[PDB]
Structure formats: C-alpha cells, structure tokens
Amino acid sequence: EGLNLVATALAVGLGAIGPGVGIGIIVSGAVQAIGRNPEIENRVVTYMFIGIAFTEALAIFGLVIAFLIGF
Amino acid sequence: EGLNLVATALAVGLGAIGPGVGIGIIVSGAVQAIGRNPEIENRVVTYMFIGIAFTEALAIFGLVIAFLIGF
Amino acid sequence: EGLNLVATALAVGLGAIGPGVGIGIIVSGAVQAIGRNPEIENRVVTYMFIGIAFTEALAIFGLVIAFLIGF
Amino acid sequence: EGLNLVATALAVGLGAIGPGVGIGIIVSGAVQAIGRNPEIENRVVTYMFIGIAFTEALAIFGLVIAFLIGF
Amino acid sequence: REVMANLTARVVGAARRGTLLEKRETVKSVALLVVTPDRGLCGSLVAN
Amino acid sequence: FFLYTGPPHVEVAAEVIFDGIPGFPITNSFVVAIIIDIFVIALAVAATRNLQMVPRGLQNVMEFILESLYNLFRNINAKYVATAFPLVATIFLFVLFGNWFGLLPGVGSIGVCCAAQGKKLVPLFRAPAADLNFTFAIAVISFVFIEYWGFRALGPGYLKKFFNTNGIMSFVGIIEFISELVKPFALAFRLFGNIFAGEVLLVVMAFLVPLLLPLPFYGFEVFVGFIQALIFALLTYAFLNIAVT
Amino acid sequence: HVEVAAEVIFDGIPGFPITNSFVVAIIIDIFVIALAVAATRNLQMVPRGLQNVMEFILESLYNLFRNINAKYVATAFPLVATIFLFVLFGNWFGLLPGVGSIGVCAADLNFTFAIAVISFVFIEYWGFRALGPGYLKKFFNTNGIMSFVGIIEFISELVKPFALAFRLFGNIFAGEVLLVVMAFLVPLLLPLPFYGFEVFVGFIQALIFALLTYAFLNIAVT
C-alpha cells in the first residue's frame, strides 16, 4: 500500500529540520563574528562553507535515502 | 510489506535530526570564538574536528543501522 | 508485520537525537570561554570531555536496546 | 506482537532526549562560568554535578521503566 | 578612583587580569615618569 | 567482569507487607519506618552523649549538620526559623535515613521467608521512602503546617493572597490556591517516585550483569536520595516563606 | 452552516459567466479609478486627503524603494506600484463589502500565478541585465565546489515567485474562510475585531508582497 509513500514522507520531513536550522545557526554565528571583526572574514569564509557542507551532507543523506525508497 | 521501509525512513530522519542542530551550534560557537581573537585558531580547529567527529559518529550509527535494515 | 524493525529504528533515532544537540552547545561554550582566555586550557578540556561522555552513555543505551531487539 | 517492543523503543529514546539535551546546557553554563570568574570552580563543580545527577535521574527513570516494559 | 576600586574588587582571576592588571613576575624592565619645570629659577624643586 | 551467573530473575512490586497484623495492621513500611526512627534516636543519644561541649567524638558531625541546616533555613527566611526549625529537621535525616538502607545487603531481598516457593515470603524491608503512605502523610503534615503558619502570621494575608490578590478583574487566587494544593500532592508523589525508582533500578539493572552496573547506579541513587531529602526540607520552608511573603 | 467554496478558475480559458474574481477585480478597479478621479480633477497646491493618499503611499513607497535600492527603484517603479494600489484593494472589496459571496443566484490561483509570472518576467528582463551572465554567476562555475547549490538557489528563486503567488492566494482565501466560519457560528466577526484583523492582515500581505518583489529585484541586482 502507501507505506512506501509514508517512508518517503518521513525521510524527507524528518532529518531536514535539523540541518535546516543548523544552517541558520551557522550563518548567523558567522555574521555576528564578522560584524564584530571584519578582518577575520577570510577565516570565516573558510569555516562557513565547510560547516554548511557537513550539515548538507546530513541533509543529502536524508534525501538520497528517500530517493532510494522511491526506487 | 512496507514496515521496514518506514522503519528505515524513521531511523535516518531521527538520526539526522540531532546531529544537524549539533553541528550548527558547533560551527556557530567556533566561528564566534575565533572571531573574538586569532592565535587560538589551531586549538579551535582541533575542537571543531572533535565536535564534527562526535556528531558524525551518531550520524553514521543511524546511517549504518538503516543500511543493515536495508538487507 | 515487522514491528521489531520500526522499534529498532525508533530506538536508534530517538537515542541518537540528543547527543548532537548537547555536544553543540557544550563545546560552543567551552570554545567561547577559551577564546576569551586560554589559561583554563586543559582544565576546560577535562571539564568538557566527561560531560560529552555522559551523553555518549545515552547513545550507548540507544544502540544497545536496538541491538537486543536486532538479535 | 512487537508493540511492546515499540513501547520500549519509544520510552528509551524519548527519555534519553531530555537529559541528553539538558546536560549540554548544564556544562555549557559551567564552562562559561569557568571562563568568567573561575574563582567559583568548587561551587560550579558541585552545582553541575547535582544538576546532571538530576538529569540522569530522569534518564534512569526512563531506562528502568523501559526495562520493565521489556520485562 | 572609586571606579577603579570597584573594578579591581570584581576582577580577581589572574588569567582575566590582563593588560595593566598583570602583576608580571621576574621584573626586568621598569619605566619612570619624571616631570620638571619648563624653565629655571624654580628654586630647589628641580634639584629635588 | 564476566558475570557468568547470578542473574536469576527480576521481580518488583508497589509495596511490601509485614507481620503483626493481628494486634494492629502493620506493613513492612511501618517496620522500616520504626527502624529508621530507632536509628535516628540512637544517633541523637550518641550525638548528645555527655553533651559537655565535647569536640569531635562523632557528635560534632551531627552538630555541624544541624548547624548547616539551621543556616540554610535562616537564609531562606527568619520569621519562623526557630519555631519551624524542628519541623524541617524532622524531615532532615529521616528522609535521608529512608534513602539509606536501600543499598544494604539484600535490601530488596530482606525478609523473603526463598525462590523455591515464595508462598508468604513478603519482603519485610519495604523502604519507608519507597511507600506512598509515608510520603503522603509527610506531605499532608507539611501542607497543614504551612497553612497553619500562614493563618497565624497573616490570616487575612493567606485569604487576601488569593481572594484579594487582585479583586478587580482576575486574581492570582484560585490558580495560586490550586498550585499550592497540588504542591502537597506533588511533594507526596515526589517521595513516592523517588526511592521506589532507585529500588526498581537496583533490582532490574543488577538483574543483568550485577557487576559494576549496580555500583554507579547505587552511588547515583544515594546522591539522588540525599538531594531529594534536602530538596523537600528546603521546599517546606520555601512554601512557608512564600505564604508569609 | 459552513458553505465556503473554492473559486479556482483558468486564466487561459475564457472567463466564466459568473466570474467572481473578475467581478471583484472590476469593482476594485472602478473604486480605484473613482478615487483617482476625485484626487486628480479636484487637486490643489496643498490638497488634504486627495493629495495625502499620493504623498503617503506613492511617495513613501518610492522613498522606501530608493532607500532599499536607489537607482533601481526608479527602473522597476512601475512593477512595485502595480503590486501596490491593488490586491489590497481587491481584498478590501472582498472583505464582506456588502456582498460577502451572498445573495448570488487575489484568492484566485490563476491570478496569483500570473502575478508571479509577471514578477519572474521582471527578473528575466531587468535582473542581471547589467551583467547579462549574472544568472550564471556563482552557479557551477570554477568555484562550484562552494557554489554547488547556486543552481539550487536559482531554482529557489524560480520557486520564490511561485511562493509569492501562493502567499497572495493564501491568507486572502483564509480570511474568506474565517469570515464564513464566523457567519456559520458566532456571527458579526467574533469577540475580537475579526474584520479588522483580516483587513490589517490583507494590507500587511500586500505590503509584504511589494517589499518581496523589491527585495527579489535587489537580490537579482547582486
């Protein structure tokens, strides 16, 4: 029946809110960090994308698994 | 039947929910602190690596649980 | 109909959710403190590691209970 | 059927989440107070210890009832 | 002056007592401020 | 290390009954409560001793504990620091005694007749903290004492704290009175859940691998019991002060 | 008794004989034209009310857009002005203005989709016109390792106008449903100023749509 669709719904829904707000926390932290001191902006640039990449690596685990459920 | 499919979906989603906000706070604190002052960049980077390792540990635990339930 | 599958999935996910959100705030606070002053150094490292091990214990419970159902 | 197993999974996971997140804020406040007025090191040690002791008091309540469902 | 009194009372941690609050050990170099009249005829003040 | 054997089984219950019911209905909790009271009386008698200002001698420990409790109560408030001090000291070292004796050898197996039959082998320990009746009685007594103290200090204040808190429009009363009423039941349930949970843990967790699993569990349980006794003792004074305030 | 219904229609297909959305749009246009006629012919050097609407709406919006994006607010002034003086007026006409979908023998999905299509055409025309290849910038370029989601960002921008249309249709339709529910049970709005809350929500939604259009234009600028 539609339990596979329930599985896709859970996969896309759960595991997305976590990284979804984690990204926001990352960028907000970087933003006030550079606002207080813009001379460290290069290091902030290096740290931002790697943190975003890791949280998005969790999100893509959430997404590609749902695609596997879809087959 | 379909119970395993939704089980895998729940496992991946609820294993991704935590580490997401985890790494988010990790990077926000790290970028804020390194924005406070340089010369501790190596130490904050080491603590950053410890944090990402500890979060991705639980991430891969959930991922491999879902992977094993896949078979 | 495969209730043990969803049971194991739920156990793993809802056991692994906690430590990420914990460790995030945990090391964020310590790294902000050390950025303020590097004197505490190892003293704060020691304060941090045991606190993280405390949530690692709950992660162990989450994994082990699922393992019992899994075998 | 495995509905009791699902009950054990729900109990252990949803009782691990609370203490798991809580102790993070506990020791984060502790290390923050270390970074600001570490004169209270003894006091913060005692107070964080009792606070966690409450947290895994809740956790062990969850774990023991989860075992009872499994019993 | 009482602002300094209160601030010194609050700040007790040696690590956080940086800047002009570091009672550094193993004294090596010391600076001194001497203030003198611009012109003479001041009496014995400059001699003192 | 290995725990090859010893994991016979696990069994728990809400409470345990005792003998002596013919002359007067006695439960195992009453036996435990009597033992705790006797131990407290013996400690007080030994603590009193010659009482000629003798330093140390194991009486200075009790004196220091009482002084610390008095200092805590004084810091909490001073209107009834003297009169109510014995009331709080009654809970102090009595709830502590109830928390103690749970880690005694065979605390959960004391008075069992015997796994062969178990016909009438009711465990006659039934830790006084691990009994709903004792906690309910203690909480009712504390609530009655707080209400009486509030009525005596400010009889109009106790009523005006709710009825006349805000006469116009809504008022803090009713909700405040309901919260205070739940506070006695909450305190009773707190003691009911505590100690009982520790015993359930010491049974179930130690039932599997009873080697260094029950050790940290019992340490945490003892710390939790002491914390709960102190919390109840301080909360009685806090409720009394809130009523006075 | 609840009797609410969906007024979904096809803009591409010919107008229906009833044409509730078209009728509401015509009424709103007639009211706006009446106000413009009243403020234009009877216009003085320092008019009160007639010129007050202009000064406090058109000039205020122009100043806000210039503050947000100067020298681009001028270029897309017509788009933001068209977003303004409309939608909000249609909702005010549709806020139970003596009819309330009763006595019949923005909420339209097609209209919202067409408005978002106009917004996206504004993007494709003006945004990145100063660059030409701006739409390709930070999207699978040599630095695509850090800009892999850049094309995903463009898709979100493509989905941003669709969400704007959804927000135009949504809330506006909600207000209608809430008014219908209040009529079915607890009429005359509600204990709270339901009608006033709905009117304020519609005005805020129109202002937010205009600001979202201006912000999307600015984002396309850089």
Short mmCIF file of C-alpha atoms in Angstrom, two decimals, chain D residues 54 57 60-61 64 67 71, chain F residues 10 197 200-201 204 224 227:
data_model
loop_
_atom_site.label_atom_id
_atom_site.label_comp_id
_atom_site.label_asym_id
_atom_site.label_seq_id
_atom_site.Cartn_x
_atom_site.Cartn_y
_atom_site.Cartn_z
CA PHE D 54 19.03 15.10 38.32
CA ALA D 57 17.96 10.55 37.46
CA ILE D 60 17.47 6.19 34.64
CA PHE D 61 13.75 6.53 35.38
CA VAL D 64 14.26 1.30 34.23
CA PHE D 67 13.30 -2.45 31.01
CA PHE D 71 10.44 -7.47 31.32
CA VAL F 10 13.81 -9.84 38.43
CA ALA F 197 12.62 4.19 41.36
CA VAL F 200 13.38 -0.72 40.86
CA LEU F 201 16.69 0.17 39.22
CA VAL F 204 16.22 -4.63 37.22
CA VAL F 224 19.66 11.49 44.47
CA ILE F 227 19.36 15.61 47.21
#
